[PDB]
Structure formats: structure tokens, C-alpha cells
Design a protein around this ligand. Structure first.
Ligand code: T7X
Ligand code: PSF
Ligand code: FE
Ligand code: ZN
Lengths: 41, 30, 214, 122, 268, 249, 233, 83
């Protein structure tokens, strides 16, 4: 049971779920939408 | 009816024939 | 009561040119795409537009003399189909006969001012009267007639002389609908390669003229 | 009975810029710009696509203040498109987008005012 | 002169070479393709010493086939793909009554029921597209919807309508003011006055519309080329350059339709 | 961008190619004498960095085809000015190669735009179902867009490659990073267009009329050049190296 | 096969080149008669090797369109406006039948619906006006009514009559001697001896009529009409 | 569209300027020529005053149809030009 929890609640839930995503290409890197649109200035 | 009547079109035909012959000679003589 | 007619002595009983396929009405000239196949027996009169991949088959008449007629991309009008347009429709919508993309029109289909949304199948002997809408992804059964102002809901199969609801189309059929249009387009393209850009009939006309002088 | 096209006909009152009021006919489930296109009030060649990204407010319309509550609220894209083409970077606070208004049977008798035309060729 | 004669001879040589190439290409095809021939389709044809009596003002489409003993009145029209086979018995078409596209009018063998009568179509009648008539006696000022089939022995009385996609069974009489329709062709409803006005207006509109088709289907080769050139020349316009040049190009009358066939009679 | 958008499309095609060649020739014949203590190398350094950054960040917020082309032109001008910043024979050679490749790609793209201009194309979403109606024009446009992006197999990659090589030769490592980031952004908004033609399924389609012969041959020749340039790029490099050396001797 | 198609396409290329040369030769002489818009309709049209086989003693109207593998027996007749298109499969028309005016006898245009069934017509079979025979089969000495809409998979047995305007649904068998009518087709009544005799006599009547129609269609084309069309002022 | 309050005020205010119209009888439903005993000249004068307080125009076929102030105020409330 501990290994089954170790499979989902950590390795799948936190390491590679959104933590890489948020610092990756679309979690916060989508600020280019909030950056390219400002070029009209 | 063995005569082509349009003088302008005849001159265009002569010019085209001359252009083709001159191009062939140009590619051959040089 | 008259019971009296005056035959014309200049009436032509045999036109050596045959029936002209493209019949312009004043400034309205039918527009046929180079990719589209129109059978030599077809008559296109008035403002009729045939788009890419479309096909019109033998015996079909597309008279756009009154209002505009449009045949969409990869949509086919099959053998002996009369497509006509009226000045106005009962519903109040514009009466242009518009056939959208991937629409299959079965043979002996009579369309008048009807609008057919994309990806539809119209059965044989189907009559679409003025101001009738056929919603997208719908199939109309063969021999079905719908009166003016009637509508076929999207995703349903309809049939019968006073066209009624039959059942609801499944996903496989509504995804197979455009594939039938694509296959018919392939067949039309196979027919399209049998005709050269210019016919060689004018040589026979010249031979006939020489047989009688000039 | 049967399924009539009249079962989804939405009557509307569209006003051209010079103040004339003509009654247009639309279909429930299609954009209000499509309904305006049928009579020819808005040139079809200017807004051929009913899509938000293919729009520079060629379909801008003025909805009545009492009839603006029975409509979805303006999205961010609609506001952004409206502001840029306003020629003054101001919001009229009651103007919508034709391509973003979907007709509904609850919109019977909605009065809409079409502003003046704008150039769109290039 | 001499240059013209030389160019004519060169053209003759080129034509001969082209025809030889066409023959060789036909040989390589295996002689499988059936060569297109001169049109042998006769618009008006005789069967048994009987000739059609088409009137001067009638518009008979070149693709139509008026065959046998057919009598057609003034102002009427026979449209594209229509067949009027009056070989076995008589067919009489009234004045101002148009027979629309792909319609078929045929007469029974004078013995289909023993007391068969010729196909009589009255005045100012309109017959819809792809309709089939096989021995009816349609009276004047009547309507036959597109796709309707009228079997032998039927009579359509004055100011009566047959719904589109109907099948009037044999020996069936449609009384005046009814809208008989359906596959059994049973009573549907009574005719309103607006429907009568619509019938008359449709007949008059078709009489009006046959004229442009008649004027277009009878043009010569020389006129067709001129009209095609004019249509190409005036297809697109440039008002700015004309204003710069001080000219106003106007559409020639050969490309202008009469205002009586436009949707609302547009003068401009 | 306003001038490019408002100008007629055949006019916009000519101003995007012809003036740049001659103006760059003038700038080169000024650099042969005007190298006053590398004063222009700094100005062109800042101008090229800013041009790349602004073009990359501005062409993503464009919905019209002509404004996107204008911002692409600005970005490629910055990429070419990278060569100006590094004053060397290899720098000038990279500059001229980039000018040639950019001119050919621009001619290709503007011929494609003029082909669709006959049906009043204004937005990128208009060319949505082009992969269905004209499945070869969509391929040609995708090839041109990828060449703009700089994908290795195409001809547009060679110019960016050799410009980056010239930049790294002079020791300007900061130019290389800016060029790399701008290239990533450029490829993103260039494949964004390719997404619309092939992957989207618009509800309403726009059908374009067939193109004419002149633009057809121009597109065919330029598309064969773009795809098959890497196989035989020797003549361009030879003529460019000969040109760069002849600026002084 | 595939070898034949290549030769067919090469023949098309060479024929196109020859026609272009002929047009160029005409242009040098100033003639422009090749621009005339003559009708390209052929009463017998083939699709590669699939060419219709029509017996000598068979009337085919000039306006009738016969395409693909179509076989016409002796004494049969295809009247005006008929479209007999069998390309993906064959259309077999027996001896003594009569495809009457504006009728349509074709085969399915694609394999998506399944297997394309060849259309078979028996002997002394009467096909009514404007009737659709879409991939069905009919036995000899049968009658098909006016406006009938037989679909594919339908077998009409010998001495079977289909009433006018009836629509026979897919995969339906009409038993011998029974009349099927209405939409959809359903049993109505059993045929009588008099109707059988009339059905037999109608075939002979139309066979005799077709001979006269062919005789009137085989006359040499009138030269007065040709001259009148030539000079139009 | 316009709210009923302002149009009701604008039709209740101007009608009291005819030196004979009773202020006690004017209301959202009060016919001009019938309920107030007006003249046809006043029947067209009220319509003219409707286009005297604004710039819009009433066609000659829209003035003699209904002489009722309820339909008049409804039409005024359905006037996009006014505010
Ligand atoms: C089977 C084995 C052989 C198999 C190989 C066979 C080969 C056949 C031999 C030669 C093939 C020649 C190919 C050369 C073809 C050139 C292109 C054809 C050009 C051409 O339209 O014709 C002339 C034009 O006049 C010239 O402005 C320029 C035209 C000048 C060139 C024409 C001179 C052709 C003489 C060739 C020498 C013939 C010598 C004898 C050859 C035959 C052997 C006995 C007709 O003008 P046009 O106003 O009436 O009309 C044209 C024409 O309709 C179209 O171009 C346009 O639509 C229209 O706007 C208008 O321009
Ligand atoms: C050997 C055959 C020469 C035949 C020469 C010839 O026909 O020129 C015409 C063609 C097409 O030009 P058109 O649009 O006038 O078609 C006219 C067309 N004939 C028609 O029927 O419409 O020109 C070329 O592209 C060929 C350029 C290269 C020419 C070498
Ligand atoms: Fe919009
Ligand atoms: Zn018959």
C-alpha cells in the first residue's frame, strides 16, 4: 500500500504533473500572450 | 481562299519564325 | 377560342451544333471551375456557380435564370436532376438554391430554392420545394418529399412522401457521409479525363460544309 | 405536425444608419451578423467568416439597453476587438459584435442599430 | 499576297501534321475511344407522315424533342430536356402553357383502356419539372407540380392544382379549387385566392422568361463570339480610371436583360 | 507595418524586396569607408538585437497576413544586421546570403498572398480550409513558412546558420542567444499558421479561384529552390565570397 | 489493365498535341471555327475499355446516354432521354425490352454502401417512363410502372408487375403475378390474365414502334436546315 | 428602445401648451381628438410637436392612422433616435 501511494500521490501527482508544467512551456511561459499583445505600445 | 489576309498577323508570324531561326543559329553558331 | 397556329418557315428542326451546354442570360454567365466535371448533356442557364471538386451528371438542368444557384465543394448533382431557383421563398429567407460542401444529391431530385447545409445525402426522387432547409449531417431517404417551409433537423434520417422522422443517425453514418461525396468526386474525376479541352467535331462540320461547297 | 423552418425564425428590427427601421429575418442558432447579411445591410464580403480571430468589428452593432440583458456577457476577445477598431480607443458600453451574438427564440423583436460602414478592402 | 500564300501553305502543312499526330495518338489508344460525331438529335421529328405544328412565337429548347403529331399554341414554351412524343396519337398544347424542364408528355396507344383520348393541355397551364403526363386532359388555367405523374384518363379541371410529387391514379378527376396531392392523390385542401393569383403570375412569368432563352438559343456563331468578347470586356469595371480619363463605359444592350424578368423590375 | 498593410499587395511585394537590396549595397559601400572606430558596429548591434526581439514579440499578436509579413520583414532585417555588427569577410558574406535567401522567400510568400488576394484574403483564419480545397497551395505556403522559421532541411536555415556563425566568429556571444530565442519565437508563430491550414476544421470555408501561369511557375521554381538548396549551395557561397572580397580589392 | 491505361494516357497526350497543332495551323490561315461550342454528347460513351455493346437491330435514341459496360439485346430499344450508366459494374438489357422515355437505369457509384450489384434486365421487360432502376434485377416478361424507383438488391420475379410511382425498398422480392405499389412498395392485388396478355402485347407494340422511330432517325441529316443555321442575320 | 418613464413625461408635459387642454385629463391613455375634444388641426399639431421637440420626421401616412396618446407614447419609446 505504501508503494502504491508512492506511485501516484508523489511521483505522478507532484513531480511530473504540474510542477514541470508551471515552469515549463505553458504553465507560466504563456505570458507571451500577456507580452506579445502589449507590443502595440 | 488560299491567302492569309491579316497583314499584321502575317508580320507577327514572320517575326516569330525569324526569332526561332535566329535562336537556333545562336545556339549553334555559338 | 382560337384553335389556330402559324408555323414559322424559319424554324430549325435540326441544330447541327446540338444543345449548347453553357447558356449565358445577358450578363449572367455560368461559372464552372476547371476541377469540376460537368457532363456534356448538362444544361447550365443563367447565374449558376459550380465550385472545385463538384460534379454534375447526365441530364441535369441547372436554371439560374431567376435567382442564383450554387454547388459547393465536392458536392455532386447526379443524373437528370433539375435544380431551379425562385424569386422568393415562403419563409422569407433568400431563395437562392445553395448546395454546400460534401452534399450528395440523388438522381431525379428536384430542388427549388432549397438550402442544403454541408454533409447531407439526398435520396433519389427527392423533392425539395421552396424555402426548405436541410440541416447539416442529415440524410433524406429516397423518394421523400418535403413541402415548402419544412425543415430536416440535423443528425436525423427522414423519408416518406409527406416526409417524416425515421430515426437518429449514429456516429459512423454521420462520419461516413462525406466519404460518399469524396468517392463520387473520384468517380467524376475518372470521367473527367475522357474529354480533351477542345472537341474535334469542327472537322466534321468542315467536311459537311465541303460536301455542299461552303 | 412537422418540423417547420418557421419554428426557428427570429424576427428582428434592424436600423440602418440613416434612421430607417426595416424588419429582418434570422435563424435561431446562427449569428446575428448572418441574419443582417440576408437582407444585405452588412456586406457579406467584409465578414465572410463568423469567427472571432477573423474579425476587426466589421459586424459591430448597437443593441438596445433593455435588450442587452438577455445576451451572454461580452468576452475579453470581444472587448479587445471593439476597442482597437473604435478609432478613438473608447467603449460605447452598449455595442456588441455581430459574429459573437447567437440568435435565440428568446430574442424575438430585438431592436438592433447598425452603425455606418467602414473600409475593409485592404 | 505572296507572304499570305506562303503562310497559308505553311498552315496547311501544320494542319496535316497535326491531323496525322491525332491519328497516331488514336492508334496508340487501341481504337477504344468512341469519337464524338455531329449532333444527330432532331428537335422536331416526323413519325408517320405527321409533322409538329409549332407556332412562330413558341420557344422550343434545342435539347427538347417534339416528335410526331404535336400542336403547340402561341406564347407557350417547351424547355430543356422535355419530350413530347405524339407518335401514336395526338398531343395538343394550348396557348401560353409552358412545359418545364425534363418533363415528359406522351399519349397512350389509343387502346390502353379502349376509349382512349389524345393528350390535351389547355391554355395558361404550367407543368413542373420532371413531371410525367401519359394521357391526361388538363384544362386551362391549371397547375401541375414538379415531379407529379398523371396517368391516362385523368382530367384536371380549371383552377385546380396537383401537388408536387403526386400520382393521380387513372380515371381520376380533380375538381376546381382543390389541391389534390400525395401518392394516392387524395384531397388535401381548398385553394385560396392568393394561390390562384400565384398560378396566373407564374404562368405569365414563364411566358415572359421564355423569350430571353429563345433569343439566346438561336444565335449564330458570329453573334456568340461577339457577345462572349463583350461579356469578357465588361465583366470587371474600374470607375477610378474612367473618372481619370473622363469617360463612362456603359454596358452594351446585348448584355442587358429586359426589366420584366428582374426580381422587382430594376431600371438601374 | 501600416505602410505595408495599406499599400496595394503588388506594391507591397516590390517595396519588401527591391529597396532593401540597394540600401544594403549603399550601407556596405559606406562601411568600406565609414568604419570610424567601430561606431556603426555598435549602432547596428543595438538595432539588430532590438529588431529581432520586437519582430518576434510583435508578429505573434497579428491576425492579418500582411502585418505578419511586415513584422517578419523587420525580424529578418535584424537578422541581416547581425552580419553588419560583425565586420569581417564572413560577416558580409553571411549578410549577402541572408539578403538573397530572404528576398527569394519574400517573393514566394507574396506570390502566394497575391494568389489568394484574388478572393480578398485578409485574415489568417481565412486560409483555414486551404489544405482541403487546394492541397498543394497549402503545402507550398507551409514550405515558405517553415523556410521563414529556419527549419534545417529548408533553405531558410542556411542563412540563419551562417549569420550565427559570423556572429560567433567576432565573439559576440550575446547576439547568438538573442538570435536563438527570437528563432524559437519565430518558429512558434510560423507553425501557428501551418496549424490553421491543416489541423483546424472551420465551420465555414472560403474557396479561392485558380491562380494564373506566371505566379504558378514563380511559385514552382521558388519552392524547388527552397527545398533543394542544401543539396547544391556551392554557387551562392562562391559568388557571395567573391562579392565580399571585392568590396575592398 | 495497368499496362493498357498507360497506353491510353499516352494516346491522349499525343492526340492533344495533334489537336493543338491543327488549331495552330487554323490560326495561321485566319480561321477560328474551332471555337464553335458544339455539343460533345455521345450516345455511346466508354470508360477506358468498358464500351457499350449494342446489337444492330436495336433502337437507341440520339439523346439517350449509354455509358460503360452496357449490353443491349436484339429487338430492345432505349428511347429518348434515357441514361444507362453502368461503369463500376455491368448493365445487361435483354432482348425485346424497351427503356421508355426519360428513364434511368444505373448502378451504384461507390463501394461504401457495399458491393455494387450489376443491373440485369430480362426479355420482353417493359420499363415505364421516368423509372429508376438502381442496381436491381428483373426477370423476363415483367412490367415496371411509370415513376417506379426500384433500389439495389431488388429481384422482380417473372410476370411480376410494379405499380406506377411505387418505390421498392432495398432487398425486396416481388413474387410472380403480384402487383406491388405505394410508398413503400407493398402487395396490392394479383395480376389477371388480361393484364398478362396486355403486358405481352405492349412489348411487341413498342418493338414495332422502335423500328419506325429508328427509320425516321436514320435518314440523312437535312442540308436545308444546315444551310439555314449557317446564315443567320 | 427607451424606458416608459421619460417618454411618458415628455408626452405628458408638452400637451398642456394648447391653452385649452385640461391638465387633469392628460394621462398615458388619452386620445387626442376623441377624449379631449380636439380638432383635426390639433390632431396634426400634436404630431408636429412630437417632431418639434426632436429632429426626426413622421411620414404623411404615419400621422392620420391612430390618434391615441398610448400608441403615440409607445411609438416614442420605440424611437432609437431619441434619448
Ligand atoms: C509528326 C512529326 C512532326 C511532329 C512535330 C511537329 C511540329 C510542327 C512544326 C512546328 C510547330 C511550331 C511551333 C511554334 C508555336 C508557337 C506558338 C504559336 C503562336 C500562335 O498563336 O500562332 C500565331 C501567333 O503568331 C505569333 O505571334 C508567333 C508565331 C510564330 C511561330 C509560328 C510559325 C510556325 C511555323 C512552323 C514551321 C512549319 C514548317 C512545316 C512543319 C510541318 C512539316 C511538313 C497565331 O496568332 P493569332 O493572333 O491568330 O492567335 C493567337 C493564338 O490564338 C493564341 O496565342 C492566343 O490565344 C491569341 O491571343 C493569339 O495570340
Ligand atoms: C507544338 C504545339 C504548339 C501549340 C502552341 C499553342 O497552342 O500556344 C498556346 C498555348 C496556350 O495559350 P492559349 O491560352 O492561347 O491556348 C491556346 C490553345 N491552343 C487553345 O486551343 O485554346 O501557349 C502555351 O502555353 C505554349 C507555350 C510554349 C509553346 C512552344
Ligand atoms: Fe465579427
Ligand atoms: Zn408511353
Amino acid at each position: 500500500r505504501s508503494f502504491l501511494r508512492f506511485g501516484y500521490e508523489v511521483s505522478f501527482e507532484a513531480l511530473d504533473k504540474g510542477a514541470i508544467e508551471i515552469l515549463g512551456p505553458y504553465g507560466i511561459s504563456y505570458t507571451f500572450r500577456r507580452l506579445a499583445e502589449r507590443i502595440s505600445q | 481562299p488560299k491567302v492569309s489576309e491579316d497583314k499584321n498577323r502575317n508580320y507577327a508570324v514572320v517575326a516569330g519564325v525569324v526569332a526561332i531561326v535566329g535562336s537556333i543559329g545562336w545556339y549553334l553558331k555559338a | 377560342p382560337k384553335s389556330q397556329v402559324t408555323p414559322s418557315p424559319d424554324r430549325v428542326k435540326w441544330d447541327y451544333r446540338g444543345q449548347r451546354q453553357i447558356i449565358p442570360l445577358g450578363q449572367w454567365l455560368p461559372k464552372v471551375a476547371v476541377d469540376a466535371y460537368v457532363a456534356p448533356n448538362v444544361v447550365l442557364a443563367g447565374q449558376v456557380t459550380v465550385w472545385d471538386g463538384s460534379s454534375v451528371w447526365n441530364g441535369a438542368v441547372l436554371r439560374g435564370d431567376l435567382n442564383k444557384i450554387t454547388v459547393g465543394f465536392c458536392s455532386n448533382v447526379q443524373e437528370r436532376c433539375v435544380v431551379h431557383a425562385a424569386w422568393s421563398s415562403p419563409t422569407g429567407l433568400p431563395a437562392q438554391t445553395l448546395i454546400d460542401r460534401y452534399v450528395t444529391v440523388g438522381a431525379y431530385s428536384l430542388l427549388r430554392s432549397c438550402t442544403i447545409e454541408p454533409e447531407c445525402i439526398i435520396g433519389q426522387h427527392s423533392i425539395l420545394m421552396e424555402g426548405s432547409l436541410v440541416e447539416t449531417r442529415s440524410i433524406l431517404e429516397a423518394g421523400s418529399v418535403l413541402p415548402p417551409g419544412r425543415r430536416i433537423p440535423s443528425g436525423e434520417l427522414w423519408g416518406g412522401n409527406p416526409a417524416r422522422f425515421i430515426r437518429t443517425l449514429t456516429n459512423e453514418e454521420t462520419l461516413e457521409i462525406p466519404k460518399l461525396a469524396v468517392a463520387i468526386n473520384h468517380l467524376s474525376g475518372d470521367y473527367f479525363s475522357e474529354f480533351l479541352p477542345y472537341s474535334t467535331i469542327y472537322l466534321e462540320v468542315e467536311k459537311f460544309k465541303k460536301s455542299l461547297g461552303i | 405536425g412537422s418540423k417547420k423552418v418557421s419554428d426557428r425564425i427570429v424576427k428582428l428590427s434592424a436600423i440602418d444608419p440613416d434612421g430607417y427601421k426595416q424588419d429582418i429575418i434570422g435563424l435561431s442558432g446562427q449569428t446575428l451578423l448572418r441574419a443582417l447579411t440576408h437582407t444585405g445591410l452588412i456586406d457579406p464580403a467584409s465578414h465572410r467568416l463568423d469567427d472571432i480571430e477573423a474579425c476587426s468589428a466589421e459586424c459591430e452593432v448597437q443593441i438596445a439597453e433593455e435588450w442587452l440583458e438577455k445576451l451572454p456577457p461580452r468576452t475579453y476577445d470581444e472587448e479587445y476587438v471593439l476597442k482597437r477598431s473604435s478609432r478613438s480607443r473608447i467603449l460605447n458600453k452598449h455595442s456588441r459584435l455581430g459574429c459573437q451574438v447567437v440568435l435565440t427564440q428568446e430574442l424575438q423583436g430585438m431592436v438592433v442599430a447598425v452603425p455606418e460602414a467602414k473600409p475593409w478592402d485592404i | 499576297g505572296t507572304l499570305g500564300r506562303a503562310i497559308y501553305t505553311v498552315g496547311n502543312w501544320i494542319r496535316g501534321t497535326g491531323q496525322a499526330l491525332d491519328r497516331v495518338g488514336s492508334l496508340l489508344q487501341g481504337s477504344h475511344r468512341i469519337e464524338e460525331h455531329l449532333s444527330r438529335h432532331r428537335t422536331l421529328m416526323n413519325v408517320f407522315d405527321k409533322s409538329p405544328l409549332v407556332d412562330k412565337d413558341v420557344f422550343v429548347a434545342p435539347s427538347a424533342s417534339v416528335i410526331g403529331d404535336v400542336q403547340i399554341g402561341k406564347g407557350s414554351s417547351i424547355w430543356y430536356g422535355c419530350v413530347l412524343r405524339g407518335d401514336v396519337n395526338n398531343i395538343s398544347v394550348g396557348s401560353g402553357t409552358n412545359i418545364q424542364d425534363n418533363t415528359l408528355v406522351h399519349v397512350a396507344k389509343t387502346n390502353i383502356s379502349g376509349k382512349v383520348l389524345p393528350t390535351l393541355i389547355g391554355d395558361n397551364v404550367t407543368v413542373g419539372h420532371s413531371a410525367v403526363i401519359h394521357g391526361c386532359t388538363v384544362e386551362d388555367d391549371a397547375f401541375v407540380g414538379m415531379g407529379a405523374t398523371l396517368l391516362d384518363g385523368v382530367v384536371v379541371e380549371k383552377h385546380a392544382m396537383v401537388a408536387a410529387g403526386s400520382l393521380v391514379k387513372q380515371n381520376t378527376r380533380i375538381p376546381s379549387g382543390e389541391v389534390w396531392g400525395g401518392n394516392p392523390a387524395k384531397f388535401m385542401r381548398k385553394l385560396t385566392d392568393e394561390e390562384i393569383v400565384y398560378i396566373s403570375q407564374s404562368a405569365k412569368n414563364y411566358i415572359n422568361l421564355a423569350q430571353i432563352h429563345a433569343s439566346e438559343n438561336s444565335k449564330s456563331f458570329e453573334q456568340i463570339e461577339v457577345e462572349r468578347a463583350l461579356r469578357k470586356k465588361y465583366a470587371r469595371k474600374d470607375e477610378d480610371y474612367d473618372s481619370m480619363l473622363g469617360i463612362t463605359r456603359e454596358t452594351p444592350p446585348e448584355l442587358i436583360l429586359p426589366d420584366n424578368v428582374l426580381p422587382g423590375g430594376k431600371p438601374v | 507595418p501600416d505602410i505595408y498593410e495599406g499599400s496595394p499587395t503588388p506594391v507591397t511585394a516590390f517595396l519588401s524586396i527591391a529597396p532593401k537590396i540597394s540600401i544594403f549595397a549603399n550601407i556596405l559601400r559606406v562601411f568600406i569607408y565609414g568604419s570610424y572606430g567601430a561606431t556603426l558596429q555598435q549602432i547596428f548591434f543595438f538595432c539588430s538585437i532590438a529588431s529581432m526581439i520586437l519582430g518576434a514579440l510583435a508578429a505573434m499578436a497579428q491576425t492579418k497576413v500582411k502585418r505578419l509579413l511586415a513584422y517578419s520583414s523587420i525580424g529578418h532585417v535584424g537578422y541581416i544586421c547581425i552580419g553588419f555588427s560583425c565586420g569581417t569577410i564572413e560577416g558580409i558574406q553571411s549578410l549577402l546570403i541572408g539578403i538573397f535567401i530572404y528576398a527569394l522567400m519574400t517573393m514566394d510568400a507574396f506570390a502566394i498572398v497575391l494568389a489568394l488576394r484574388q478572393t480578398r484574403v485578409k485574415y489568417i483564419a481565412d486560409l483555414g480550409a486551404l489544405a482541403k480545397t487546394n492541397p498543394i497551395l497549402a503545402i507550398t505556403f507551409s514550405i515558405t513558412m517553415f523556410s521563414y522559421a529556419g527549419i534545417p532541411p529548408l533553405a531558410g536555415f542556411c542563412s540563419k546558420f551562417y549569420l550565427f556563425f559570423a556572429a560567433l566568429g567576432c565573439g559576440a556571444y550575446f547576439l547568438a542567444l538573442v538570435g536563438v530565442v527570437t528563432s524559437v519565437i519565430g518558429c512558434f508563430y510560423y507553425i501557428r499558421l501551418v496549424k490553421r491550414m491543416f489541423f483546424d476544421t472551420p465551420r465555414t470555408w472560403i474557396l479561392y479561384e485558380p491562380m494564373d501561369r506566371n505566379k504558378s511557375l514563380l511559385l514552382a521554381m521558388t519552392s524547388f529552390f527552397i527545398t533543394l538548396f542544401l543539396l547544391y549551395p556551392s554557387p551562392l557561397f562562391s559568388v557571395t565570397h567573391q562579392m565580399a572580397l571585392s568590396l575592398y580589392l | 489493365g495497368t499496362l493498357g491505361r498507360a497506353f491510353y494516357s499516352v494516346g491522349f497526350w499525343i492526340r492533344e498535341t495533334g489537336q493543338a497543332l491543327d488549331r495552330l495551323g487554323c490560326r495561321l490561315q485566319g480561321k477560328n471555327y474551332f471555337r464553335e461550342q458544339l455539343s460533345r454528347h455521345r450516345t455511346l460513351m466508354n470508360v477506358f475499355d468498358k464500351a457499350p455493346i449494342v446489337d444492330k437491330e436495336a433502337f437507341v435514341a440520339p439523346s439517350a446516354s449509354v455509358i460503360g459496360d452496357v449490353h443491349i439485346g436484339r429487338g430492345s430499344s432505349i428511347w429518348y432521354g434515357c441514361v444507362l450508366r453502368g461503369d463500376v459494374n455491368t448493365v445487361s438489357v435483354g432482348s425485346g425490352t424497351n427503356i421508355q422515355d426519360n428513364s434511368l437505369v444505373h448502378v451504384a457509384k461507390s463501394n461504401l454502401s457495399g458491393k455494387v450489384h450489376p443491373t440485369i434486365i430480362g426479355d420482353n421487360v417493359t420499363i415505364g417512363h421516368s423509372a429508376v432502376l438502381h442496381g436491381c434485377t428483373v426477370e423476363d416478361e415483367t412490367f415496371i410502372g411509370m415513376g417506379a424507383t426500384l433500389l439495389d438488391g431488388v429481384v422482380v420475379e417473372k410476370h411480376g408487375m410494379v405499380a406506377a410511382g411505387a418505390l421498392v425498398r432495398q432487398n425486396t422480392r416481388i413474387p410472380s403475378g403480384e402487383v406491388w405499389g405505394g410508398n413503400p412498395a407493398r402487395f396490392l392485388r394479383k395480376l389477371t390474365d388480361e393484364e398478362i396478355a396486355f403486358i405481352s402485347q405492349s412489348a411487341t407494340n413498342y418493338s414495332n414502334l422502335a423500328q419506325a422511330h429508328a427509320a425516321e432517325n436514320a435518314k440523312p441529316l437535312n442540308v436545308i436546315e444546315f444551310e439555314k443555321v449557317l446564315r443567320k442575320k | 428602445f427607451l424606458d416608459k418613464s421619460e417618454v411618458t413625461d415628455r408626452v405628458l408635459s408638452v400637451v398642456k401648451n394648447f391653452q385649452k387642454v385640461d391638465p387633469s385629463k392628460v394621462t398615458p391613455k388619452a386620445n387626442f381628438q376623441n377624449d379631449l375634444g380636439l380638432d383635426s388641426l390639433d390632431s396634426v399639431e400634436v404630431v408636429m410637436a412630437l417632431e418639434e421637440e426632436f429632429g426626426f420626421e413622421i411620414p404623411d401616412n404615419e400621422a392620420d392612422k391612430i390618434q391615441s396618446i398610448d400608441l403615440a407614447v409607445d411609438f416614442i419609446a420605440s424611437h432609437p433616435q431619441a434619448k
